[PDB]
TrEMBL record, chains A, B:
ATP binds at R99, E101, H110, S111, F114, E215, V216, G264, R267. Mg(2+) 3 binds at E215, S218. Mg(2+) 2 binds at E215. This is AsnS-like asparaginyl-tRNA synthetase related protein. It comes from Pyrococcus abyssi (strain GE5 / Orsay). GO terms for molecular function: asparagine-tRNA ligase activity; ATP binding; metal ion binding. AMP 1 binds at R99, E101, S111, F114, Q116, E215, V216, G264. The keyword Ribonucleoprotein does not apply. Residues 89-283 form the Aminoacyl-transfer RNA synthetases class-II family profile domain.
Length: 294, 294
């Protein structure tokens, strides 16, 4: 779409809903004693997004700052762990992510710029975080019924499936989404170095929306031990050089066990509004593979 | 400071205060019927930050996005105006800004990454917005007295200085800040093309903190007429191509009269904690001229 066409759309309703969602979600966390952090957009280090069955192996956008290469935020995962290392205990941030994925990921829920409500909790287990998210989502859906007068899924807790079993039964997370009528969990997904792996089991979780809307949240317990972290990085063919300051902190023994998740705000807006494509709820669309004109 | 030293700092109280500040300010705006938008970090267009007394003519950092040159957000001013054009009426956003200024700007209040609470109001006039910001600050300061047990500036309304009168009496905005015990306004400052100028008078305003803490907020009424906008860009030596899609919307006569401002969140946290350098309230410092290690 061209500039004038974009500004001509009627997205008042979507933005009204977005406002209510942000109000609800931020209060949910501050009510429970979480600290509210501001995002970082440039850093020597960022989320590799690899290995990850959900990705194609993209490289972060990079810009020089005073002669030094910085990466644009893929996600603040590493910085969340660092915030826990600073003793903040329970944190969240409204974090813009930049992920320059290909046209092949333009499936209606992807956007090359998007904001996650990203949170982390010192000492938490996967069960704790999944339960917290269920509490948030159930509460959100009840409020949405009041806001819209429409019905939303009423489940207070969601069924749990192993990634391996999803592949066997449905073939893909996307096909699973199409068949379900309530949100559900996919757990135990082999992916990035920071997700906690124990004896072949990955302590992680993705929340998937029903009716084909796809993944809305992703998280896990974390690795915190230097030796384990470095082995995982090397095994994936990644470079220690790409994580130098983070690995210095890990080597010093300053990472702590924690668990967390990120929640796609615009993906939730899309679900509540019932929009076919996420672009319909964004003032300034950022469609994968298509450089925005504004 | 190496990475280990950075995360070994104490920042708990500062983040505690920041959390209370963000809760307060976001509610202030949502209570008044403002829509809560999400930020954009990459665009073909951004705030030129020039001409501007407080700038130094820095050019936006750029990155390739699917073969197209995109600018990292200096400020969302142009995008705020486009949101008004879309009929959103009253909007705000927690917008990260990237401004790669020189070491000369490392004065205790500047950071090369920072977040503004940026807001815009269709049809608003400068007196309206200044009164709104005064209302916000007065309320925040009364709350801060409860949070901290210390005393803050009392005034319900701040003294207004014309820019040229600040230059005459104090020499600069910094010197003025150091000699005041109450927040004050500086108005009528010649700067960027988007600020409204009528008969040699600029309808804009900066809020300055006392005790040398310096500027905390800046805004104004906007130009919306194509001919007026084009003339100011051309006279400034700026290239029209740099603002193409924005100018298309102006030409189509879709821009509307509006006024707004941005409020520096970290600068407020600094003022309330009483920190000498703004780095002290940031988990991940972004000091002008010093590329961050994390
Ligand atoms: N935010 C997610 C990672 C992601 O960005 O997908 C997490 O906490 O693990
Ligand atoms: N946010 C300001 C511009 C700035 O100081 O970045 C405005 O509303 O005009």
């Amino acid at each position: 779409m061209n500039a004038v066409e974009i500004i001509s759309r009627d997205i008042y309703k979507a933005i009204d809903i977005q406002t209510k969602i942000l109000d609800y979600m931020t209060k949910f966390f501050t009510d429970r004693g979480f600290k509210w952090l501001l995002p970082i957009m440039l850093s020597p280090i960022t989320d590799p997004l690899w290995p990850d069955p959900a990705g194609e192996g993209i490289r972060p956008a990079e810009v020089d700052v005073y002669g030094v290469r910085m990466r644009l935020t893929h996600s603040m995962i590493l910085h969340k762990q660092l915030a826990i290392a600073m003793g903040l205990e329970k944190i969240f941030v409204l974090s813009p992510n930049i992920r320059l994925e290909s046209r092949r990921k333009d499936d209606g829920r992807h956007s090359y710029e998007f904001t996650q409500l990203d949170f982390e909790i010192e000492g938490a287990k996967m069960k704790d975080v999944m339960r917290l998210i269920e509490e948030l989502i159930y509460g959100l859906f009840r409020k949405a019924e009041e806001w819209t007068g429409r019905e939303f899924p009423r489940a207070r807790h969601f069924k749990v499936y192993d990634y391996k079993d999803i592949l066997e039964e449905f073939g893909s997370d996307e096909k699973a989404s199409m068949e379900m009528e309530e949100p559900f969990w996919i757990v135990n997904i082999p992916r990035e170095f920071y997700d906690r792996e124990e004896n072949g089991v990955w302590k992680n979780y993705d929340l998937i929306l029903p009716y084909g809307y796809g993944e809305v949240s992703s998280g896990g317990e974390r690795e915190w031990e230097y030796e384990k972290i470095v082995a995982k990085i090397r095994a994936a063919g990644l470079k220690e050089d790409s994580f130098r300051p983070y690995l210095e902190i890990a080597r010093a023994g300053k990472l702590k066990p924690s668990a967390g998740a990120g929640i796609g705000v615009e993906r939730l807006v899309r679900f509540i509004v019932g929009a076919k494509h996420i672009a319909e709820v964004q003032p300034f669309p950022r469609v994968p593979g298509i450089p925005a004109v504004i």
